[PDB]
Amino acid sequence: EEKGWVPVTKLGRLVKAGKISSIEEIFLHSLPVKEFQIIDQLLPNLKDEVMNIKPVQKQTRAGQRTRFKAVVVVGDSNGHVGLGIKTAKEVAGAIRAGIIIAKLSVIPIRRGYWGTNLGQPHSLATKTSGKCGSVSVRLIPAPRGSGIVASPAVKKLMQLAGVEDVYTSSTGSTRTLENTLKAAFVAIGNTYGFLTPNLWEVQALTPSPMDVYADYATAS
């Protein structure tokens, strides 16, 4: 675990300099991420749960050659989710690369209220859907304490989200796991991508961090 990490991708340089307080200043400005050490540094306690190691095959002139596709979901149960599907000949290498991919694609979500807002919102803020292949997933907010009503895979996704309660409904052939997980992840990520009526005010568009701190990037 040699934390050398020469910083490519100027943002990461800033992350090394400690000039980014949180990934908020990333997500607020839609800053792309390429190095997983950044998401390692900002969110300190990612937990991963590999969902499936699907064997995948191809036909050459001499027999069948096989890889494995790992579908691993990452999160911290505090409003940060990510999904990584990645394939490799070795299972361990596949799962490590999937961890990297999922860590890169971390997505923040909008935990809302079923009604009569109280401390620490429990459910989502809006019914939200997603689609992958024919897997069409739907998430409807839940009264507090109703728990996560979902399929095993979606249930693990929601627990990694930190949402303690949400109703789900999926149509299509959810027998496949990669499509179901991707669609549910897209749906949970669309929560912010939906104008919630408690947000009339148009903000003054605070300067981007890598703009105000472009000096410290690209160490000559």
Partner: protein
């Protein structure tokens, strides 16, 4: 809110739950009574309350 059926049946529910004491005396709001985490109702079993009062010494004994 303030619906007389709501105000009466929900208040009776709170009264029963605080008479049994599964719900705390601060969370009497008809909203906290929606999440109980089934362990709480187990905690008010006779054997559990005996052991917390003593007399039990490895609950199965009390059982």
């Amino acid at each position: 809110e303030k619906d007389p059926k709501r105000l009466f049946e929900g208040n009776a529910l709170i009264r029963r739950l605080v008479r049994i004491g599964v719900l705390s005396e601060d969370k009497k709001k008809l909203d906290y009574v929606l999440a109980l985490k089934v362990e709480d109702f187990l905690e008010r079993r006779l054997q559990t309350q005996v052991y917390k009062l003593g007399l039990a010494k490895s609950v199965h004994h009390a059982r």
